[PDB]
Design a protein around this ligand. Structure first.
Ligand SMILES: C[C@@H](c1ccc(Cl)cc1Cl)n1cnc(-c2ccccc2)c1-c1c(C(=O)Nc2cc(C(=O)O)ccc2N2CCC(N3CCCOC3=O)CC2)[nH]c2cc(Cl)ccc12
Ligand code: NA
Length: 87
C-alpha cells in the first residue's frame, strides 16, 4: 500500500508475471529487477556481449518499439515505463 510505488498496465504486467512476479503493485526497482530476470530466462541478451539485449520478436520488443538496445542507454526503457506505470 504505502511501500509500493506503481501499478503496471496489462502488457507490462503480463511480462512481469512471466518473470515470476505476483500481484499488481510494485516499487520501480522491482519492475526493473523483474524485467532483468525476464530478459535472462527468455535469453534475450548476447552471452558473449552482455550489454546487448535482443527483444525483437518478443512481447518486450513490441512494448519498447525496438529490435534491440544497449543497457548502457536507459532511454527506451524509461520512456516505456512512463507509458506503462500508473503511479
Ligand atoms: C544496472 C541494470 C539496468 C540497466 C539498464 C536499465 Cl534501464 C535499468 C537497470 Cl536496473 N542492468 C545491468 N545489466 C542488466 C541486464 C543485462 C543483460 C541481461 C539482463 C539484465 C541490467 C538490468 C536490470 C537489472 O535489474 N539489473 C541489475 C540490478 C542490480 C541492482 O539494482 O542493484 C544489480 C544487478 C543487476 N544485474 C543482474 C543481471 C546481471 N547479468 C546480466 C546477464 C549476464 O549475467 C548477469 O549476471 C547484470 C546486472 N534490469 C533490466 C531491465 C531491462 Cl528492460 C534492461 C536491463 C536491465
Ligand atoms: Na530467446
Amino acid at each position: 500500500g504505502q511501500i509500493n510505488q506503481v501499478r503496471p498496465k496489462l502488457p507490462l504486467l503480463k511480462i512481469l508475471h512471466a518473470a515470476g512476479a505476483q500481484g499488481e503493485m510494485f516499487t520501480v526497482k522491482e519492475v526493473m529487477h523483474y524485467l532483468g530476470q525476464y530478459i535472462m530466462v527468455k535469453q534475450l541478451y548476447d552471452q558473449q556481449e552482455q550489454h546487448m539485449v535482443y527483444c525483437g520478436g518478443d512481447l518486450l520488443g513490441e512494448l519498447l518499439g525496438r529490435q534491440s538496445f544497449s543497457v548502457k542507454d536507459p532511454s527506451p526503457l524509461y520512456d516505456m515505463l512512463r507509458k506503462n506505470l500508473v503511479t
